[PDB]
Amino acid sequence: MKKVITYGTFDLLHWGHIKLLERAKQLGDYLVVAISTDEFNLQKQKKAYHSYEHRKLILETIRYVDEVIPEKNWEQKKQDIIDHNIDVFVMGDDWEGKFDFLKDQCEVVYLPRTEGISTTKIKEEI
Amino acid sequence: MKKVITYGTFDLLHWGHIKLLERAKQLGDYLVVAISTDEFNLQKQKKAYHSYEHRKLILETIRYVDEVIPEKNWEQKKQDIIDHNIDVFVMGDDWEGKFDFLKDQCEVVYLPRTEGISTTKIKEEI
Numbered sequence: 588m589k590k591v592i593t594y595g596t597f598d599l600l601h602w603g604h605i606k607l608l609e610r611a612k613q614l615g616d617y618l619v620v621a622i623s624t625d626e627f628n629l630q631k632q633k634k635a636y637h638s639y640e641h642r643k644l645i646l647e648t649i650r651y652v653d654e655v656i657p658e659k660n661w662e663q664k665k666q667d668i669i670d671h672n673i674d675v676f677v678m679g680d681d682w683e684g685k686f687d688f689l690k691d692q693c694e695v696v697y698l699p700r701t702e703g704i705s706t707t708k709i710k711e712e713i
Numbered sequence: 714m715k716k717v718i719t720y721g722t723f724d725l726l727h728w729g730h731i732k733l734l735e736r737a738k739q740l741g742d743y744l745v746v747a748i749s750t751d752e753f754n755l756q757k758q759k760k761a762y763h764s765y766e767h768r769k770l771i772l773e774t775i776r777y778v779d780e781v782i783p784e785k786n787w788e789q790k791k792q793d794i795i796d797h798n799i800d801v802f803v804m805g806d807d808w809e810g811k812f813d814f815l816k817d818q819c820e821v822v823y824l825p826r827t828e829g830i831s832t833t834k835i836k837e838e839i
């Protein structure tokens with residue numbers, strides 16, 4: 588089995604998030620998503636409108652997602668790969684190159700973001 | 714096969730919608746979701762931040778959802794229920810009593826809304 592993993596906040600779920608999860612799942616045959624806690628989201632200079640409990644609730648229902656775990660800190664990644672027998676690590680390309688240190692453990696893939704949509708555009712126009 | 718159908722806009726999909734779809738599917742073996750077109754939304758004196766195309770895309774990925782069709786007008790219910798062989802019509806109880814005219818065709822049920830969350834709240838708080 589080819590196991591894939593991706594990390595993120597996924598607040599105010601939109602079609603750009605959907606498209607990221609879609610391609611990620613299709614890079615293998617099982618997808619794990621580590622969703623950022625509200626404490627960690629803050630370490631990213633961000634504040635989620637939806638709570639961790641509710642953000643995880645919604646994401647667990649999306650077909651592409653097989654299971655959800657919490658993202659608590661930056662250092663947990665290498666162990667996550669070992670614990671979940673991960674074969675592919677994926678993120679949107681705004682993280683291009685930031686996680687190349689995991690290449691010696693698994694395949695690393697950066698997916699081009701979906702142009703035209705973001706959580707900032709949503710709040711701003713709303 | 715016990716078929717269920719439900720109608721709605723589902724803009725800015727949140728946890729309240731998810732719990733409605735979860736309990737809707739719990740009622741039968743298959744769930745059809747008829748999503749309000751941007752044109753029909755106007756007839757309900759509303760305007761969705763997310764277009765139909767995008768609201769349908771995300772919705773289609775929810776595991777509880779087997780099939781999606783457009784809700785174009787108020788009158789299509791009778792014909793829809795016949796076309797899709799629906800056995801159970803369900804809506805959140807903020808619509809209680811409003812669709813009882815369908816009882817001569819199928820089983821009508823109302824589920825208690827999820828208090829504390831709504832599309833308007835998200836917009837006003839943002």
Ligand SMILES: Nc1ccn([C@@H]2O[C@H](COP(=O)(O)OP(=O)(O)OC[C@@H](O)CO)[C@@H](O)[C@H]2O)c(=O)n1
Pocket residue numbers: 594595596597598603604607623631658677678679680681698699700701702703704705
């Ligand atoms: N239009 C968009 C918006 C987002 N994304 C992707 O959505 C995923 C995560 O969305 P975020 O909520 O912004 O999570 P993020 O802050 O990028 O996670 C950062 C950290 O958890 C990494 O360890 C990312 O892979 C991002 O590239 C995308 O492809 N297209």
Ligand SMILES: Nc1ccn([C@@H]2O[C@H](COP(=O)(O)OP(=O)(O)OC[C@@H](O)CO)[C@@H](O)[C@H]2O)c(=O)n1
Pocket residue numbers: 720721722723724729730733749757784803804805806807808825826827828829830831
């Ligand atoms: N906290 C909430 C919010 C919404 N809902 C349910 O979500 C479904 C639809 O959400 P809406 O986007 O508000 O669509 P609506 O305008 O209610 O549909 C109207 C019309 O199409 C019916 O013929 C409804 O069954 C509603 O009761 C809920 O149970 N709990």
